[model samples]
Target: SPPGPPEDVKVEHISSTTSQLSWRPGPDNNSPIQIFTIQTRTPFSVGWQAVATVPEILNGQTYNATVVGLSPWVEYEFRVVAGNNIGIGEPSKPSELLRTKASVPNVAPGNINGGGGSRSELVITWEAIPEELQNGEGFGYIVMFRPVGTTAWMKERVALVESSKFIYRNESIMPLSPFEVKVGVYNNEGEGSLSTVTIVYSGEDEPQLAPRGTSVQSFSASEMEVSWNAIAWNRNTGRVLGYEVLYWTDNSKESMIGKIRVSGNVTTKNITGLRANTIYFASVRAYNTAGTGPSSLPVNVTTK
Candidate 1:
């Protein structure tokens, strides 16, 4: 009799770049099992390619292996089986098809809009697509911009804002200069597609630096207070937009420990409910339609 269907089949982690595969060994009570074979191929391909073989995978043992060296942003199918003197046990049912991550885009959006008056800033935005379309992994957006006529593109910052809109203000940039903007979506592995390009010209007489100065004060056993100088352009923008405050517990580590969005230019925000006597690093950034300005240099303090 033909060996029954392959049992206990399961798919491990699946990503655009790699996949891990494993399955339960088949029963061969009447005879000793010889070897097992693994096969895989692209979805549209006509035949399967023998990728691997294992000898003497004991009964009931789970066979596992990671298949690497796969092309990014592609789909493939796989199958496995056990064999012996009686011939190959019936091939296991084909595994579901899987796809790898897609390539990142090379460009970003163009023609951004900025607020009017003394601190005019470029407001930028972009749309989001399914991760599968960009590649396998999902990551936040990377924004880049520079003076429109400048030769180099500066890496301004990254955001988990989860919103399509961003602002680049005059305070963070040179006044009366035309700015070119672009954005890239990326995960840990790599970057995705860039959006259309954007250009904005800051008006003459715009302030070279925002009036506000961000600071971290009032360290206590359970909390800290962060304050900042407000941008002079806040009034024309219709009430100061909210602020993003980021912090990390370890000064040596660069990753942000936490983030908060606040309404109004409320300087001296009380960051409460923290671990007592624990040291923390904090920074703040102002935001509007143009996108976020560079983060303030990190300030180090220990909580009481």
Candidate 2:
């Protein structure tokens, strides 16, 4: 069966010479949509020029294709046509129009730097390439980490995500040792030179800082609740995924216990089954993709 037309076409992140168009799939008479034919042209042009042919078009899903080799200073519209193994399905509704200004930066981003997260975990950041030199062209950043003592290098392939930050989610490492890190710039045109390498230490994945403003309260002698606001995402460890709750009822440090797992989205939780009218001290710690964090300030509560 022939598929239906595409819908909700979106055009975004256009550079001086390239743009990305995304859209959701339409009906496909029970047949798997096989391909998507993307084309572009000037509003006043006669025929649309072929831009991309996504051979793997999945049904009931959204697709994004980046169209490159565009002419700077020219306005163009993009559209998509869906098809299955039998034949082409429906052509998309009207496509959206977009244009470009100048071109991407001719040089790489500057002030590239790196720091350690959990001895091995690392993060790299940079200042965007100078805008005047960039000419309004969109650019993607590339961050690389290589050991000065060895010839091996790790590449973080983050394409089309024009970001100033990236977490070095890599393997094991040595603490207090120096590793070379670098950042480079690239676009549809090509890649520019890399920035000067900066040295950072290891054994650092621990949170740069503990969770802030942790608090607790007693709902009853047998019930207690704890809550905290999530910390901002940082490259140092990885993004905080969830949290750990630690509790203690006795003043003895040896009596302390817990690493209870809590969902990342849950900023609050209830604990029950404690001695009535007992004093409890609770602490919360955040963890990210890299690992766990240092616990927050201990908040104490007395049960009724």
Candidate 3:
């Protein structure tokens, strides 16, 4: 039987990170085209690599092929062909080369610094790296943390503002006990490669003073607010992901009442569920992919 026309050949979506190719097969009269071949290559390259060849191009079926492991932020061209024992049909219209999205950050800040005391507040900081091959662009950072002796580390915070910093002051931490911390950096996508571990020994020592310029604003009866400016750091070195807000009522007790995560130059947090008109202490810290930076000076406020 005569093979039908190449009716629905198309490339759905094309990007620097992913490629979606789809096409409809020729008609079948008992014995249709047995297979299809998909080929792809960089726009500048001369040779075409066989990405895939489907054994059966079912009539009226949409065939899709996804190509991964390609360079991020790069362009590539693709083409497809329908084939059977009778003969291999002409190649489908070649897709204009499309670039894939850049890979996510591979390294995130770690080995955070500047955290200690009976208050269980610790500031963390680390370095950043790229997600894949280091293109001209540098790395971004992310920080993840959990209490010591715990099996898992939860809470993933991106550094959108600074390159290295995060502050944690949860009241749930065990006072006078040691806590383990880790930091990692990433490329653009927020994926991470971690750093060597750092441990903080909490003891009955004076709370590590927060960075200067820390401020506390009065909020509602159940809440108070705290904020601070980003540490004087190189913005071009990496991006500041967000800020971590830590608060507690007791100085000797290790643990925080609340933790707030904010992004992109946001440095304020309205802490809620406090004892009415009671004095509460809070601290703010900046974070990037490296990790939490030094904590701002602890600020005290009374809830109205």
In TM-score terms, which candidate is top?
A: 2
> Model 1 over residues 1-304: C-alpha lDDT tens digits?
4355465555577765567777776666465555666677775556877664233242334477666655566676667777766766766766777776555533343333443333455555566443333333454677777886787976654544244666665576544467787776765556766666677555433222332566676557888888777666643342235567887785343334788767676655778877776677778766543345557667767776
lDDT of 3 by residue, 148-253 (tens): 7887876555544345666676676554456677766554554546666777544233322333577888859888878777644453333345677888775343
Q: Candidate 2 regions off by >4 Å? A: 1-104, 130-138, 160-162, 203-304
- Runs with alpha carbons beyond 4 Å of true place in candidate 1: 1-5, 10-16, 24-119, 131-139, 171-178, 187-304
**Candidate 2 local lDDT, 245-301, one digit each (tens):** 888887433454555768767888788776677778889887644457688989989
Q: Rank by TM-score, descending?
A: 2, 1, 3
lDDT of each: 0.60, 0.69, 0.59
Consecutive 10-residue window with the lowest summed lDDT within model 2 = 53-62
Judge candidate 3 against the unseen true structure and give its global Cα lDDT, from 0 to 1.
Answer: 0.59
TM-score of 1: 0.34
Per-model TM values vs. the true structure: 0.34, 0.35, 0.32
